[PDB]
């Protein structure tokens, strides 16, 4: 019931490139607040790179920072927040779990929204872990593979063809 955790302003058009990362954040507010936090942290860092001075962008980022400060406080004594190494592993491993879920569906020839979303979200989470520093080679490889699969399978199903 912290007011700072209430919804943000509408996303500025300048920040279109982080719309899906922010959506991922909010879909995890209950499910996994650690993921919710770091997705917002990435959105904040990326948004500042893009535009922190245009009034709408400055206002949006100011509210996002309010929400980050509140959420960090509320997460309290959480290892994945107090220890960057653990936070990075938490996100990397959550990405890997949905990646391997989607891979298992793919290998079985089971194509559906959930595994498409799992591939795509895995790729978004690898974007997010750039907040911890340089990506590993395997990070780069997984993000590319996952986003390719999400796009490819989606397009095939849209056209009625088996991937």
């Amino acid at each position: 019931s912290m007011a700072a955790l209430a919804p943000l302003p509408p996303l500025p058009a300048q920040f279109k490139s982080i719309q899906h990362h922010l959506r991922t954040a909010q879909e995890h507010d209950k499910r996994d607040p650690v993921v919710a936090y770091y997705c917002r942290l990435y959105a904040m860092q990326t948004g500042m790179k893009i535009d922190s001075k245009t009034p709408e962008c400055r206002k949006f980022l100011s509210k996002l920072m309010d929400q980050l400060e509140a959420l960090k406080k509320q997460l309290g004594d959480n290892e994945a927040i107090t220890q960057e190494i653990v936070g990075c592993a938490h996100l990397e491993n959550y990405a890997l779990k949905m990646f391997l879920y989607a891979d298992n569906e793919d290998r079985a020839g089971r194509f559906h929204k959930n595994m498409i979303k799992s591939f795509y979200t895995a790729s978004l989470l690898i974007d997010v872990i750039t907040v911890f520093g340089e990506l590993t080679d395997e990070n780069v490889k997984h993000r590319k593979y996952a986003r390719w699969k999400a796009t490819y399978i989606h397009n095939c199903l849209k056209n009625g063809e088996t991937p």
């Binding site: 922190s52 920072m65 400060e69 960090k72």
Partner: peptide, 14 residues
């Protein structure tokens, strides 16, 4: 840019 938002951002990471 080095502004007040980036300074608040750095404080989160401390």
């Amino acid at each position: 840019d080095f502004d007040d938002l980036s300074r608040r951002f750095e404080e989160l990471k401390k």
